[PDB]
Curated annotation (Swiss-Prot), chain B:
It comes from Saccharomyces cerevisiae (strain ATCC 204508 / S288c) (Baker's yeast). It is found in: Nucleus, Nuclear pore complex; Nucleus membrane. Its main location: nucleus. The chain holds residues 742 to 1037 of 1037 of the full protein. It comes from the Eukaryota. One of its GO terms (biological process) is mRNA export from nucleus. This is Nucleoporin NUP120. Functions as a component of the nuclear pore complex (NPC). NPC components, collectively referred to as nucleoporins (NUPs), can play the role of both NPC structural components and of docking or interaction partners for transiently associated nuclear transport factors. NUP120 is involved in nuclear poly(A)+ RNA and pre-ribosome export, in GSP1 nuclear import, in NPC assembly and distribution, as well as in nuclear envelope organization. Keywords: Coiled coil, Membrane, mRNA transport, Nuclear pore complex, Nucleus, Phosphoprotein, Protein transport, Translocation, Transport. GO terms for molecular function: identical protein binding; structural constituent of nuclear pore. Component of the nuclear pore complex (NPC). NPC constitutes the exclusive means of nucleocytoplasmic transport. NPCs allow the passive diffusion of ions and small molecules and the active, nuclear transport receptor-mediated bidirectional transport of macromolecules such as proteins, RNAs, ribonucleoparticles (RNPs), and ribosomal subunits across the nuclear envelope. Due to its 8-fold rotational symmetry, all subunits are present with 8 copies or multiples thereof.
Swiss-Prot record, chain C:
Functions as a component of the nuclear pore complex (NPC). NPC components, collectively referred to as nucleoporins (NUPs), can play the role of both NPC structural components and of docking or interaction partners for transiently associated nuclear transport factors. NUP85 is involved in nuclear poly(A)+ RNA and pre-ribosome export, in GSP1 nuclear import, in NPC assembly and distribution, as well as in nuclear envelope organization. Transmembrane segments: none annotated. This is Nucleoporin NUP85. It comes from the Eukaryota. The chain holds residues 639 to 744 of 744 of the full protein. It is found in: Nucleus, Nuclear pore complex; Nucleus membrane. Component of the nuclear pore complex (NPC). NPC constitutes the exclusive means of nucleocytoplasmic transport. NPCs allow the passive diffusion of ions and small molecules and the active, nuclear transport receptor-mediated bidirectional transport of macromolecules such as proteins, RNAs, ribonucleoparticles (RNPs), and ribosomal subunits across the nuclear envelope. Due to its 8-fold rotational symmetry, all subunits are present with 8 copies or multiples thereof.
Length: 146, 296, 106
């Protein structure tokens, strides 16, 4: 029942109002699922679980290609039923900004497939403009040194 | 008149240096520039040069000389680039910025080649810094932009932060500079790209928020147009929205104008997540915004 | 007479009279205002000047009649110079407005 009250009526405030600087509220979210049952975890987590895989990948820095994929494919579905619920929708955009940012920060694997991955997780108004902008400058810089 | 014109020995080491300074102090900076174009000395005549200039090539001379510094660049293994730079510094100092500007363009051409020739990073920064100053002085702001941008292996980004801060934060510079930059963005906006890179965008974006301090429309309008041209329009509306809120000393007629623009920009987006602007951390709907203009 | 500045002024004066309802408005924008004057940039606007333009569209133009919309569309198809959907025409106007506006402030 309590799954339904954060996902179907008011998106987490520990992923919307959380300060991005030190992420102190975001890891309260994480720690209070360590106070909630883990002896019977895989029977009540399906909205809460998306939160769990998200939090381990970003907070604790568990950047594995497989982990990244698992979250993205799941998060497409998840986005597809609460991109129209109030609050929840605004939080999804935060999540997406964080995951995209996190991949450069650990070394971008720079394969076709992970380029793909970036666009398969939803993008904002400045982001789609930036990518096209930067790719021509980057080419220019290469041809710069004699 | 009496020495260096009846006794010009053509492509001789001695009479080339003597002439080249003598014209320079007589204020003919064009004719001096012509002389280095009759031989780039580090290669043409190598680094062997007279005993009294040798003193200058080192730091074994303790008098007056600014040309001292020009001899110093015959010791360095980046000798072509360093030489021309020194000529740039020399012209700028005697107030003949046109000819300095010529010299550092060659100096920069030389530095890019000399990246397979060992050339110090600390050297590079100072050399490129010297180029930006000349362009800024005549206000040829288009070229300032190219040199920084493609020159990220030439400078550190922080020295770059300072340069853009200097022209953004100084009012003498700000209108003329901003106009040259934003024109170039608009040309490229059309094409599907951005004229700037994403790294450049954030440095600027930061520099423009320092201005904001107590709201103020002008501060807001500069950051607003900045957002508008990088196709960050949704975020452009958030900046507008703050002018409304942050000041309660605005007229009803001032408020109504801002709301209309915020309402219109979101309503031209037709998505499910670009139908709102963020106020702090609070989601403010397109419906709530329209009601706010209706409440006026 | 290539007195494009004043040409705009007379057309605006005529439109401000509230006796036009929504179809003696559909006709004017596709014949004159949008193709000649707002597709070409040559005018410096600002936040307020753009706002006021926002006021005119939102209050008095758009088709409420189903027959009016379908008719505007057939006419658009036959003589193309304006976006075919009119909710894509909302978008296209705003963009040209924003160009004029940007150019004053740069």
């Amino acid at each position: 029942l309590a799954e339904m009250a954060i996902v179907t009526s008011l998106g987490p405030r520990l992923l919307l109002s959380n300060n991005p600087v030190q992420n102190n509220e975001l890891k309260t979210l994480r720690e209070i699922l360590n106070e909630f049952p883990d002896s019977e975890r895989d029977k009540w987590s399906v909205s809460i679980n998306v939160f769990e895989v998200y939090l381990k990948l970003v907070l604790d820095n568990v950047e594995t290609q497989e982990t990244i994929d698992s979250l993205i494919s799941g998060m497409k579905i998840f986005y597809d039923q609460y991109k129209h619920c109030r609050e929840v929708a605004a939080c999804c955009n935060v999540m997406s900004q964080e995951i995209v940012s996190k991949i450069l920060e650990k070394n971008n694997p720079s394969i076709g497939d992970s380029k793909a991955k970036l666009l398969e997780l939803p993008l904002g108004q400045p982001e789609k403009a930036y990518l096209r902008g930067e790719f021509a400058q980057d080419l220019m810089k290469c041809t710069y040194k004699i | 008149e009496n020495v260096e014109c009846p006794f010009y020995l053509r492509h001789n080491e001695v009479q080339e240096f003597m002439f080249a300074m003598t014209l320079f102090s007589c204020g003919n900076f064009d004719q001096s520039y012509e002389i280095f174009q009759l031989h780039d000395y580090p290669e043409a005549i190598n680094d062997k040069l007279p005993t009294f200039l040798e003193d200058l090539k080192s730091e074994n001379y303790h008098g007056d000389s600014i040309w001292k510094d020009l001899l110093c660049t015959f010791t360095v293994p980046y000798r072509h680039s360093a030489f021309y730079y020194q000529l740039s510094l020399l012209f700028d100092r005697n107030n003949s910025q046109e000819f300095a500007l010529k010299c550092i363009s060659k100096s920069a051409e030389y530095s890019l080649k000399e990246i397979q020739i060992e050339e110090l990073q600390d050297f590079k920064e100072k050399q490129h810094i010297h180029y930006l100053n000349l362009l800024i002085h005549f206000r040829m702001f288009e070229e300032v932009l190219d040199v920084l941008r493609l020159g990220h292996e030439c400078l550190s980004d922080t020295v770059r932060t300072n340069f853009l801060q200097l022209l953004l934060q100084e009012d003498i510079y700000s209108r003329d500079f901003f106009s040259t930059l934003l024109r170039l963005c608009n040309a490229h906006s059309d094409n599907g790209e951005l004229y700037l890179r994403t790294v450049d965008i954030k440095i600027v974006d930061s520099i423009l928020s320092q201005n904001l301090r107590s709201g103020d429309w002008e501060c807001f309008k500069k950051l607003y147009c900045f957002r508008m041209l990088n196709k960050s329009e949704r975020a452009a509306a958030e900046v507008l929205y703050q002018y409304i809120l942050m000041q309660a000393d605005l007229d009803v007629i001032r408020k109504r104008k801002c709301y209309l623009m915020v309402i219109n920009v979101l309503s031209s987006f037709d998505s499910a997540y670009d139908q709102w602007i963020l106020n702090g951390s609070k989601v403010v709907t397109l419906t709530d915004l329209r009601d706010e203009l209706r409440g006026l | 007479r290539e007195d494009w500045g004043q040409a705009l002024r007379l057309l605006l004066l005529l439109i401000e009279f509230p006796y036009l309802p929504k179809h003696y408005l559909v006709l004017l924008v596709a014949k004159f205002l949008y193709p000649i004057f707002l597709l070409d940039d040559k005018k410096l606007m600002d936040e307020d000047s753009v706002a006021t333009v926002i006021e005119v569209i939102e209050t008095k133009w758009d088709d409420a009649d189903e027959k009016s919309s379908n008719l505007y569309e057939t006419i658009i198809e036959a003589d193309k110079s304006l976006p075919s959907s009119m909710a894509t025409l909302l978008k296209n106007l705003r963009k040209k407005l924003n160009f004029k506006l940007c150019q004053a402030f740069m």
